[PDB]
């Protein structure tokens, strides 16, 4: 065990790991290590308060998100993982924020499209009655394709998505999809579905008898 105070096989590897951990976080102070207690301490910084205190919002949002909303959020924020866990989502969201891709107004619309108006009112302190009015006269952060797939996902039932997996077996591939957003991700990787060609989405909806949803995709794009 080797400790790091902020202000392994051997000590040399432990120092290398901590020295790289400081640069990764952005910090770069004076290094003082004790060979008896097995601890290293760290002045300067150039990468502090909210850049650390903002993450508390993201942590509370992700922990209260839940199974299927995790997919919606990760799908809308490009980098999507099929059936993610708290450790997968928290890690991916904190990676996006550190990359600069994630913003507060984006996160608000992301939570709005998810249908988590409860989290907008309680955690983000944004009135959803105001947010729905704000999104009326403002260009969406997400693609018409992104929003279409999300709309189809909402209208498709539990039985249709079970039948969808059975029909997906012609392009799978065991691992097989567990949700419609998982099926979309598999097709996006296989390059059959995409923002330019949604023919594959309509082919599945025609073979699921959801002609209303097939017509809705045609009406949407």
């Amino acid at each position: 065990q080797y400790k790091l105070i902020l202000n392994a096989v051997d000590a040399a590897t432990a120092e290398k790991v901590f020295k790289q951990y400081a640069n990764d976080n952005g910090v770069d102070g004076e290094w003082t290590y004790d060979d008896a207690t097995k601890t290293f301490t760290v002045e300067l910084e150039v990468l502090d308060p909210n850049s650390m205190a903002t993450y508390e919002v993201l942590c509370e949002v992700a922990r209260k998100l839940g199974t299927d909303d995790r997919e919606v959020v990760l799908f809308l924020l490009n980098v999507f993982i099929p059936q993610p866990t708290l450790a997968q989502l928290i890690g991916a969201l904190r990676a996006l924020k550190e990359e600069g891709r994630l913003t507060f107004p984006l996160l608000a619309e992301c939570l709005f499209r998810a249908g988590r108006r409860d989290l907008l009112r309680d955690l983000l302190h944004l009135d959803p009655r105001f947010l729905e009015r704000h999104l009326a006269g403002t260009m969406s952060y997400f693609s018409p394709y992104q929003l279409t797939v999300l709309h189809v996902d909402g209208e498709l039932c539990a039985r249709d998505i079970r039948s969808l997996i059975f029909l997906s077996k012609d392009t799978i591939g065991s691992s097989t999809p567990q949700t419609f957003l998982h099926w979309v991700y598999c097709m996006e990787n296989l390059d059959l579905l995409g923002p330019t060609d949604v023919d594959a989405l309509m082919s599945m909806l025609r073979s699921l008898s959801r002609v209303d949803l097939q017509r809705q995709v045609q009406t949407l794009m």
Partner: peptide
């Protein structure tokens, strides 16, 4: 403060929307 929080959010959203 609430109306001001909704105002501030709109200002910040419009700022990122005006970048690109």
């Amino acid at each position: 403060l609430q109306v001001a929080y909704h105002x501030l959010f709109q200002x910040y959203d419009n700022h990122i929307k005006s970048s690109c």
